[PDB]
């Protein structure tokens, strides 16, 4: 008789899911830019769990970091409402489910997926031509034309397509002066150098030098009650830092940050990540959902499974003897929402 999970349970589960997801991507695609929204992915899977049953359902909840018998829908609704409050970042998310029109959808799923997660389901004919354009145009519309041509290919024994895209360009609480921006070398690796517009700013920032993990941590507050936590590893050993990237480590960092005079150098960069959720969540124990035989009877009585699941996230960033924070080599970052502590984005900039 497990009642609705607490907000604190959701915070723990999503954050564990966030870091385990990064850890997988960092080993899947090394030496590559990483950028994704863990909370967005958690929400999409939680939404699908509305129509999931049996082992299909169990794998999702446990994969998300919850008990098998947990009730997560009340908590997620409240979380999403809080994240999408007017004083927040006002993230525009393309959150849609596309299923074969020949399949009758349960109105309970349609109601709950929209009411609890603001997800929109659609019945479409899945011929590769018209279907791809229809979905891509919708995603483009939902993201104010920022994310175009999301789907590149599409089989046509395709019965169910999950789409989840988000573009983010926030405003700093303390902006960079363009007169202090200067072109500098960004050292991608030992043999590769990229010229970047290096923004600079001298002032008070919450900052911490991690002796143990050999990295610098700095907090950059956004307008909208969120902040970017930038993690700059010392020379070499970015891999060792990634191995230590845990909810525990994050918590230690947040307690260790002190407001200090810092000389900050941050490059202007635009990065993105595009992920096949089938292959990524495969290593997270969520397998049945993406294969035929899945139990999605809560969505439709006809047999159904997720044919394709795509997540894409795009990010644009544009006394006495103070510490220097110069990000002219690959670095990690998180975007954390202040009120809930929710991890909105995780990323790594290798190629700016």
Author numbering: -5 to 312, 328 to 361
Copy the relevant paper text.
Hypothesizing that a serpin reflecting a highly conserved sequence may offer insight into the delicate balance between folding and function, we designed conserpin (consensus serpin). To design conserpin we used the consensus approach and a previously reported MSA of 219 serpin sequences. Conserpin (396 aa) shares the highest similarity with α1-AT (137 residue differences; 62% sequence identity). Characterization of its function, structure and folding reveal a serpin that is inhibitory, folds reversibly, is thermostable and resistant to polymerisation.
Z-conserpin showed a highly similar inhibitory profile to conserpin, with an SI of 2.3 and a kass of 2.1 × 107 M−1 s−1. Z-conserpin exhibits reversible, two-state folding upon chemical denaturation. The equilibrium unfolding and refolding curves overlay almost perfectly, revealing a midpoint of denaturation, [D]50 to be 2.51 ± 0.01 M, an equilibrium m-value, mD-N, of 5.18 kcal mol−1 M−1, and a stability ∆GD-N, of −12.8 kcal mol−1 (a loss of −10.04 kcal mol−1). The crystal structure of native Z-conserpin reveals almost no structural differences upon mutation (backbone RMSD = 0.23 Å); the sole differences surrounding E342K313 are small side-chain shifts of K342313 and K290262, most likely as a result of electrostatic repulsion. A caveat is one local residue difference, K343E314, in conserpin that may partially negate the effects of E342K313, due to its salt bridge with K165conserpin. Regardless, the structure of Z-conserpin reveals essentially no structural changes to the native state which disagrees with reports of structural perturbations within the native state808284; therefore favoring the mechanism of Z-variant polymerization via a folding intermediate.
